[PDB]
């Protein structure tokens, strides 16, 4: 009642369920869906499902998932400073963390339930999107470590490619993923 | 690039390749600096303390958005040879910048 998560039913359910998917009113207001509050959510099944992920999705899938979670935790830590001094007062590495977190939220976490393609996502498609995002972040951190301005990294068209990778059909996705990986390598090769 | 000062030293600046004005009074200095600032293209302008204690307080109404022209107070001609206190200058600059005026 009133969105108060401290109410008896929510607290009672908190003590017995294995996964807790907390929805956020602020995310729903800005039409960010599924509107899961990442900070308030958790799952207790992550460790037990790792062998299945290795056998069925990819051997390094848990490492990619942990990398994404670590990036989100770092972005959440930096947001406290951002809300104090603004995003432009950060260094280039921290600003890159902020922008990669925004990319993760808008291009990976977001999912349109009423879209003809984005409604369903396979495990391998999600793995490919995560791999593209992490490769882009690694290339961007390498470029930033040698003086490349962040303001021009964000203008690369591969950013839009990753952003629109959501709306690619399942059978067309592997070719799109290969092309996106090649473009990720090439664009950061071009930046000196 | 300009320096305004007494005429006997205004010659040296154009003698070094720079350009300089000969001034005789504080009002002349103020008119000179407004008549220099209204137009752009000057990196540095200098006026001595003898006829202007605060060069920036004379044109702040124009530099507050386009502060590219750097301003600097310099020593007077008599004070040049006889010297002047830089500790007092340090403390007044501290008063202008941090404001405490408390240092040793």
């Amino acid at each position: 009642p009133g969105g108060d998560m401290s109410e008896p039913v929510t607290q009672s359910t908190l003590r017995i369920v294995g996964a807790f998917w907390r929805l956020d009113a602020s995310l729903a207001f800005r039409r960010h869906f599924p509107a899961i509050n990442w900070n308030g959510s958790y799952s207790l099944f992550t460790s037990a499902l790792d062998p299945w992920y290795r056998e069925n999705v990819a051997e390094d899938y848990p490492e990619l998932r942990d990398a994404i979670s670590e990036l989100l935790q770092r972005e959440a830590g930096l947001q406290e400073i951002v809300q104090l001094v603004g995003p432009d007062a950060l260094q280039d590495a921290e600003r890159l963390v902020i922008e990669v977190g925004r990319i993760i939220r808008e291009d990976f976490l977001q999912q349109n339930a009423y879209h003809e393609v984005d409604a369903y996502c396979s495990m391998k498609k999600a793995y490919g999107i995560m791999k593209m995002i992490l490769a882009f972040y690694k290339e961007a951190e390498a470029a930033i470590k040698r003086g490349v301005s962040i303001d021009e990294i964000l203008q690369l068209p591969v950013l839009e490619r990753i952003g629109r990778a959501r709306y690619v059909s399942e059978e067309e996705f592997p070719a799109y993923f290969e092309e996106a990986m090649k473009e990720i390598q090439g664009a950061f090769k071009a930046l000196a | 690039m300009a320096v305004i000062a007494d005429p006997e030293t205004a010659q040296g600046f154009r003698l070094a390749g720079l350009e300089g004005y000969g001034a005789s009074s504080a009002e002349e200095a103020q008119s000179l600096l407004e008549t220099l600032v209204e137009r752009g293209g000057y990196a540095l302008v200098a006026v001595d303390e003898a006829l202007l204690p605060d060069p920036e307080r004379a044109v702040e109404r124009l530099m507050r958005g386009r502060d590219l022209p750097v301003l600097l107070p310099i020593a007077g001609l008599k004070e040049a040879f006889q010297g002047h206190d830089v500790e007092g200058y340090m403390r007044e600059l501290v008063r202008k910048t941090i404001g405490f005026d408390i240092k040793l």
Partner: protein, 206 residues
């Protein structure tokens, strides 16, 4: 704001964030003050060098203008064009841009430097050293003033957080706590009434 336990926790988290921001800003201010105190010594050294250059320039100018006619030296200076000898490039200091004056020292661009006076050419080098000291002092002093204004902004932010923000959040926390305690007291009253009714029914008509 609607008083709820979740909202109370949100306000308390905001208070914690504000306190941590105050501490972070104070550390930033300490770093800025250390930089400022190094830069003030650099500025005093530059100012002393400027004083020395001013002496060595105007002493030479006085002698040259007496040994040689002022008209000859004036014409020699007028043969030199008033060119743009320096460039202003914006150096970055703590997230802000300040112009650094880079003097090209265009000795080859000063056309017609030859002159009949005996010590004018030395005065030309002396006055160019004077201009170099000028640009050095200006370069140090612009950075010094920018650091001073950064310290002012940081102190303003610290004062604002310590005076307006934190007490306000604390007042909202107190208000929400009072409302929640009021609701608890009303619930206790209702429960007492319910127990009284149960006892009355049981003990009078079972």
């Amino acid at each position: 704001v609607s008083p709820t336990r979740m909202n109370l926790l949100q306000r308390r988290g905001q208070l914690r964030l504000a306190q941590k921001g105050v501490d972070l800003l104070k550390k930033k201010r300490d770093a800025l003050v250390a930089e400022f105190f190094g830069l003030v010594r650099e500025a005093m050294e530059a100012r002393k060098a400027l004083d020395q250059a001013a002496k060595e320039a105007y002493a030479a100018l006085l002698l040259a203008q007496a040994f040689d006619g002022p008209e000859v030296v004036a014409g020699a200076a007028l043969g030199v064009p008033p060119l743009e000898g320096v460039e202003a490039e914006v150096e970055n200091v703590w997230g802000s841009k300040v112009p650094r004056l880079k003097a090209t020292f265009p000795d080859g661009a000063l056309l017609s430097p030859v002159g009949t006076p005996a010590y004018t050419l030395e005065a030309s080098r002396a006055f160019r050293r004077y201009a170099e000291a000028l640009i050095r002092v200006a370069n140090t002093e612009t950075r010094l003033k920018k650091i001073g204004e950064e310290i002012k902004k940081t102190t303003r932010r610290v004062n604002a957080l310590e005076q307006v923000v934190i007490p306000g959040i604390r007042a909202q926390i107190r208000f929400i706590q009072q409302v929640l305690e009021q609701r608890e007291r009303e619930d206790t009253f209702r429960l007492k009434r319910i127990k009284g009714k149960i006892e009355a029914r049981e003990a009078e008509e079972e």
